[PDB]
């Protein structure tokens, strides 16, 4: 008769009685659990079972000997099947990771698009409330500022009033610069007269022309600056921002 | 015009004023600088005191030559003076403290009394009005929580549940792991029967009572059994017979 599913038309019907089996020995053991614990005593000994549970101990060693030999040699042809399918299931994976790409794009959607969703409005409605708490800054720092102004000085001793001129014992030294300072503000006294003597002869000698070798300076650089200059000095300038 | 002179140090970018300006102009301003040079006085006094600071260069470094080398010796003195007194610097300091914490009382009086004259109302507005910000929050513990929440599922998985059965092509591992075990577990299960029928056959031989005892709970188990032949198939032979 019929295969496994769709075939199930009357396979079967007289299915249902295989329950009634399992079922109906629980309709009738309650009438049977009665006539059993009405003989129950005995005349047994703790002897006799020590026959036969030392022959059944002994029926565990027997039987564990060939079976032991088995689940050994079975379990090599899934370990060799195993490390050959090995290189079946690396491009067997390959072959479903590309094409799933439609599912994780729209969990990509579905945690991205509906991450912004959240802080659009958020960034918002804190920045709009935050100027509550601006006020909580900005008219705190300045009224603090009245008292903490005061408790920098209030605060820093007496200075040290004395009231008598012999109420520090104290020395002045530091011979350590102070000679070799001395030296090079000496050898520098002399320097700032010899660098004047012959500057002063210098300057003295031309009270008159001074204004004029100066202009004899000036008079032929002058009438090229109208000239052959005026390109180059139009632009002036250029600059910051690298070339 | 632009910014007429330079923010930066600048050998590259000056290119741009340094061609143009030496293709105009910035050869023939030298020529004109040595005609004004060459004209007066004077062609000698730009060297007669250029050398006497060319000789103070190294008359510095000539002068600073015997004292520079000969010199960190004359002052070594002044500091092991410091690390003596930055380790006996005691005398001063256990009797100037005693008299001062006197005032240093009427100084804490200036500092905390008028710190919490303020400290008090600078927060007696905003610890009540805190409770406008917890409407900001509060309210809004929703879309930070109560859907930030519900991406503990969007993240693993926002159900794969498809609209159509349609949809997966999917297969069976099948083999290797699976009949291994049901073939070694298979015979193992049936020799589990046949130390089950053996270990539980040895118990009895120590049984009794009564004679009555045993033909009560035949039945429940006889009747279940009865109608196990039911299965009909419509064949009635099974070809398992295991069946
Ligand atoms: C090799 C190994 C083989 C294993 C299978 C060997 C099985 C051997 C036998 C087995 C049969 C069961 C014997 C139980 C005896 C109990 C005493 C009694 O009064 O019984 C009676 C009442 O019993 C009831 O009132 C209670 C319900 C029945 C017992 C169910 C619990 C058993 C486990 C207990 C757990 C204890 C836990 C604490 C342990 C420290 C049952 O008998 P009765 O029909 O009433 O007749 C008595 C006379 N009368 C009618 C005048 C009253
Ligand atoms: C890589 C190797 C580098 C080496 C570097 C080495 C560095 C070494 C460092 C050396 C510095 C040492 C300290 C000298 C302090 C002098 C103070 C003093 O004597 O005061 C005197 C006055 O004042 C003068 O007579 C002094 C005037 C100083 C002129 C300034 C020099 C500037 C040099 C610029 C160079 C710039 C740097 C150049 C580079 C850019 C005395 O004061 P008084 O007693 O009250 O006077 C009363 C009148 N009476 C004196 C007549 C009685
Ligand atoms: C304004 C900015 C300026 C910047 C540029 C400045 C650059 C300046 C310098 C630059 C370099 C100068 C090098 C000179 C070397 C001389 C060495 C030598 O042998 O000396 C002697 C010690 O020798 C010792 O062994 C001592 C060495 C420690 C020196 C550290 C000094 C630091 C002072 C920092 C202070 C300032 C801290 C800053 C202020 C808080 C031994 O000499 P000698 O062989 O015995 O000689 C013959 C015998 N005789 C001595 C009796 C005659
Ligand atoms: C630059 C870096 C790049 C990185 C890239 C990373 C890529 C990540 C990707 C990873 C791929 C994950 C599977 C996604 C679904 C596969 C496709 C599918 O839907 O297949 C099928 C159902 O689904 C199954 O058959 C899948 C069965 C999964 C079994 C449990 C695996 C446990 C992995 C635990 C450990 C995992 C450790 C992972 C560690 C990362 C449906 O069939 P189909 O194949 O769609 O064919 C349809 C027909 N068509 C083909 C004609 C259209
Ligand atoms: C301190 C306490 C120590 C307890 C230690 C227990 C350890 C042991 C565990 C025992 C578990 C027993 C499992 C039996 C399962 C049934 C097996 C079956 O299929 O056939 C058997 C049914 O016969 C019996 O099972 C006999 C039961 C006799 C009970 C005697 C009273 C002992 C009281 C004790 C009170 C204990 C209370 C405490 C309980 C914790 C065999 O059939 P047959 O009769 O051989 O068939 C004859 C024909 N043939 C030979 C051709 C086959
Ligand atoms: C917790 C640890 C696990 C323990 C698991 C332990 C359990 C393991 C399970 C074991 C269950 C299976 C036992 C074997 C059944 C064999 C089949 C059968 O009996 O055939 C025989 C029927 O002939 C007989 O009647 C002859 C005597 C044997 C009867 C056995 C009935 C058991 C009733 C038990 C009641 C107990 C009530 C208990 C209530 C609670 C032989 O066939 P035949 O020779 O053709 O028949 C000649 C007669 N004819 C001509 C009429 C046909
Ligand atoms: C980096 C930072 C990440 C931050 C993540 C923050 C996550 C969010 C944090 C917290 C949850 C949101 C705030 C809830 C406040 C209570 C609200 C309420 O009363 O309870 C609620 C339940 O609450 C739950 O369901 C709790 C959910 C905890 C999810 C943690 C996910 C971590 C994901 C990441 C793991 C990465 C692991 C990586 C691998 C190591 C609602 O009550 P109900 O009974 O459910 O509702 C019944 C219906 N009713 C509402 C109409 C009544
Ligand atoms: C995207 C899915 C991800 C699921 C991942 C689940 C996690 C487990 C990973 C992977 C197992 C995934 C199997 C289910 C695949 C989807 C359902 C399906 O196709 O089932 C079918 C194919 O059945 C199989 O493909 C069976 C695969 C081999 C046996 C199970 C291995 C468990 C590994 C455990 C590894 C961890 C243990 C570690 C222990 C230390 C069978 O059922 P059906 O479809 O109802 O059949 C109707 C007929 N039809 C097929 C013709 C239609
Ligand atoms: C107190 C609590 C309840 C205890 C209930 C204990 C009940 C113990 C019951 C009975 C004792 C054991 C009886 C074994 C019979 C073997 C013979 C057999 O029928 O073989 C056949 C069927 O083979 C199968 O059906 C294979 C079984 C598959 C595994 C099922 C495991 C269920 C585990 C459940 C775990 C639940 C616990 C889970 C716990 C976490 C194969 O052989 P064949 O091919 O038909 O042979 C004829 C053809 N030939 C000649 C060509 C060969
Ligand atoms: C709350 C749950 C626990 C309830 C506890 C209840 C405790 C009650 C328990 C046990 C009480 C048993 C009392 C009857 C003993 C009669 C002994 C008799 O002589 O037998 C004879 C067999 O013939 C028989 O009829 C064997 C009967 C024993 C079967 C008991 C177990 C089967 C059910 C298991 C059900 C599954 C259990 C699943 C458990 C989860 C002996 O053999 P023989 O061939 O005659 O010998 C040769 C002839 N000669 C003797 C003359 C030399
Ligand atoms: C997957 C779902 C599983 C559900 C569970 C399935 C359970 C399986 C159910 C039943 C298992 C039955 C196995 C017994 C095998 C006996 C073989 C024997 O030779 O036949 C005997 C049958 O008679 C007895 O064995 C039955 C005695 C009935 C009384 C039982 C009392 C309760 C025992 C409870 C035990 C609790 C112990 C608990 C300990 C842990 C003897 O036959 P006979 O009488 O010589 O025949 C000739 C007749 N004449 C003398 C009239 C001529
Ligand atoms: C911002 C940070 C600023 C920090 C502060 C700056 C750093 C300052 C800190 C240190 C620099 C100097 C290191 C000296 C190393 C000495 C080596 C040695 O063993 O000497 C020892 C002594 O010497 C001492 O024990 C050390 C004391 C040095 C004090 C500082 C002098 C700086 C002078 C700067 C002067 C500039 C002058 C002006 C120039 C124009 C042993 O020697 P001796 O045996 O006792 O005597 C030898 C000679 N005799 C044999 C002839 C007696």
């Known amino acids: 008769d019929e295969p496994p599913q769709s075939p199930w038309d009357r396979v079967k019907d007289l299915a249902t009685v295989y329950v009634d089996v399992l079922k109906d020995s629980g309709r009738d053991y309650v009438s049977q659990f009665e006539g059993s614990a009405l003989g129950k005593q005995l005349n047994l000994k703790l002897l006799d079972n020590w026959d036969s549970v030392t022959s ?4 565990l060693r ?3 000997g060939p079976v032991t030999q088995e689940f050994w040699d079975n379990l ?10 090995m290189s079946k299931d690396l491009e067997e994976v390959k072959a479903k ?12 959607q579905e945690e991205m698009e509906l991450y912004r969703q959240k802080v659009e409005p958020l960034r ?13 800054l900005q008219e705190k720092l300045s009224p603090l500022g009245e008292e903490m102004r005061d408790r920098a000085r209030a605060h820093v001793d007496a200075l040290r009033t004395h009231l008598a001129p012999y109420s520090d014992e104290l020395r ?5 610069r102070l000679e070799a300072l001395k030296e090079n503000g000496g050898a520098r006294l002399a320097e700032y007269h010899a660098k004047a003597t012959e500057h002063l002869s210098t300057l003295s000698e031309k009270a008159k022309p ?7 300076g000036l008079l032929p650089v002058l009438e090229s600056f109208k000239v052959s200059f ?7 300038t250029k600059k910051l921002n690298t070339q």
Request: aromatic share 8%; no cysteine.
């Open 230 to 236: 005026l390109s180059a000095l139009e632009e002036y």
């Open 56 to 59: 059944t101990f002994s029926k």
């Open 210 to 216: 001074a204004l004029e070798d100066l202009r004899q």
């Open 172 to 176: 002045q030294r530091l011979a350590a």
């Open 97 to 108: 990771v590309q094409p799933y790409l439609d599912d994780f794009q729209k969990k990509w």
């Open 62 to 64: 027997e039987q564990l």
């Open 76 to 85: 090599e042809k899934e370990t060799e099947g195993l490390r050959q399918e």
């Open 124 to 136: 918002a409605e804190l920045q709009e409330g935050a100027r509550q708490k601006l006020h909580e």
